[PDB]
Design a protein around this ligand. Structure first.
Ligand code: NAG
Ligand code: NAG
Length: 457
């Protein structure tokens, strides 16, 4: 199989990309623990900034943002109790210094505040403090996954919680927050899990003049639950194309309002992840999902990091690295300084090829073999690229022993031979770069099942 690399961006290219499309979401209550108690956080984020030149954008939110109340007179960043360190708190408070800690991050920061408890004055005070403390503030969410609120939540005001109820609530909360802050272009609106029963298409229809308050429209996407866990299905190249397709309408609806779309919270599987979430294959999902989502028109994807020590989809923890970080790293490397990406394949098979442009010139090609592999002879697929200049190209390979490979259990993936230190996220090992001949403007590469290859032109 053979892909031509066009000399300028194809018609099915992505829009002009963000300086750092691969971002990170941190569970609200846990954010200070990530900054204070998890030495890998600093280095894992610095490694990605080292590739792209831009700090990964971050988002601080999740279900616990709708369990949280702002305490203007607390000198604590976050105050809560849990019976078991693996549990998320049922209630918590956060001080101004929570926003101050967010404000120490140099990359774009999105922070999520509470709408479920209907404490509008308290959320307005939190928003004003966020604007004062967070120089790199990007956006503020007013409620997380409002599609999961019910008639028993304060925000529902003793009436059924419907899509229409949410959309009207969001307009009122956008107007109150922005009116109080004399602000516009600030709110990360929707924040919906999937596209039903609430959608960006429905919300945008209702926003009217409240769109000037919106910074971006936000979707959450988790392809699987612990119950639908299937690693082959997750990482499948054509399966990813199907999986994201319902969001195309959402992206269209945001961009029609001249507002970017984001996946402001996304990861492989729900409830902190299941048995497939810590695997290399989940990293390969992440890599390909990022590329397809950006071509679809999303600006940024923010990959969720949950309870410290009880999070299967996390890129890192206190003591160990996670296989999925390799997908985030490789994605960041593929996109670094790039203006555009285009799909060279038709997304009907397991095999992907993407041309990556800078200044409307092809600079890299990303190749992906999504075939699932755990035992026996490992299959492979040859990829031929045409329209190349020169005598030679270089490549870096992402591989591991198996689709199931976990860093714990000692089957760390490698990115061009390198790994990341448990407990620090420091880069380890000698980088190996592959060479391939160019003859008649053609080069051929071989990817084993469950591999990716980044070719530099
Ligand atoms: C600001 O917030 C309050 C709720 O605290 C709301 O009643 C009021 O209408 C808001 N003011 C403006 C100007 O939007
Ligand atoms: C993108 O367009 C190219 C032609 O320029 C076509 O070969 C390829 O299949 C297309 N891919 C998709 C996913 O539309």
């Amino acid at each position: 199989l053979t892909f031509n690399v066009p000399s300028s961006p194809p018609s099915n290219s992505s829009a002009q990309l963000s300086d750092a499309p691969v971002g990170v979401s941190f569970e609200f209550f846990a954010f200070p623990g990530y900054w204070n108690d998890v030495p890998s956080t600093s280095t894992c984020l610095q490694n990605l900034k080292d590739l792209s030149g831009t700090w990964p954008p971050i988002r601080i939110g999740g279900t616990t943002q709708d369990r949280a109340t702002y305490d203007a007179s607390s000198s604590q960043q976050v105050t809560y109790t849990v019976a078991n360190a693996g549990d998320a708190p049922s209630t918590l408070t956060f001080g101004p210094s929570f926003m101050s800690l967010a404000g120490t991050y140099a990359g774009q920061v999105t922070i999520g505040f509470n709408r479920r408890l209907n404490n509008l004055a308290n959320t307005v005070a939190a928003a004003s403090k966020a604007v004062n403390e967070i120089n790199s503030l990007h956006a503020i969410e007013l409620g997380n996954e409002p599609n999961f609120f019910s008639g028993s939540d304060p925000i529902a005001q003793g009436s059924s919680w419907t899509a229409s109820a949410d959309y009207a609530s969001e307009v009122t909360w956008q107007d109150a927050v922005c009116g109080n802050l004399s602000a516009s272009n600030l709110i990360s609106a929707g924040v919906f899990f999937g596209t039903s029963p609430m959608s960006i298409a429905g919300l945008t229809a209702v926003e009217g003049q409240a769109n000037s308050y919106v910074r971006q429209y936000c979707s959450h996407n988790y392809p699987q639950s612990k119950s639908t866990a299937n690693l082959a299905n997750l990482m499948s190249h054509s399966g990813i194309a199907s999986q994201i397709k319902p969001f195309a309408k959402e992206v269209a609806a945001a961009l029609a309002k001249n507002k970017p779309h984001v996946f402001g919270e996304t990861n492989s599987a729900t409830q902190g992840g299941g048995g497939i979430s810590p695997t290399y294959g989940a990293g390969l999902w992440l890599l390909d999902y990022v590329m397809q989502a950006l071509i679809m028109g999303t600006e940024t994807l923010y990959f969720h990091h949950g309870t410290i020590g009880n999070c299967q989809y996390c890129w890192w923890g206190k003591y160990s690295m996670g296989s999925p970080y390799f997908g985030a790293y490789f994605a960041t490397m593929a996109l670094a300084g790039a203006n555009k990406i285009a799909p060279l394949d038709d997304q009907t098979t397991g095999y992907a090829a993407y041309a990556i442009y800078k200044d409307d010139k092809p600079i890299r090609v990303l190749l992906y073999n999504s075939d699932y592999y755990t035992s026996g002879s490992r299959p492979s697929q040859t990829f031929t690229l045409t329209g190349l200049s020169g005598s030679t190209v270089s490549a870096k390979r992402l591989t591991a022993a198996a689709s199931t490979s976990r860093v714990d259990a000692g089957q760390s993936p490698t990115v061009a031979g390198q790994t990341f230190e448990n407990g620090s996220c420091k880069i380890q090992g000698q980088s190996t770069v592959e060479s391939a001949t160019v003859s008649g403007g053609k080069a051929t590469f071989t990817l084993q099942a469950s591999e990716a290859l980044l070719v530099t032109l």
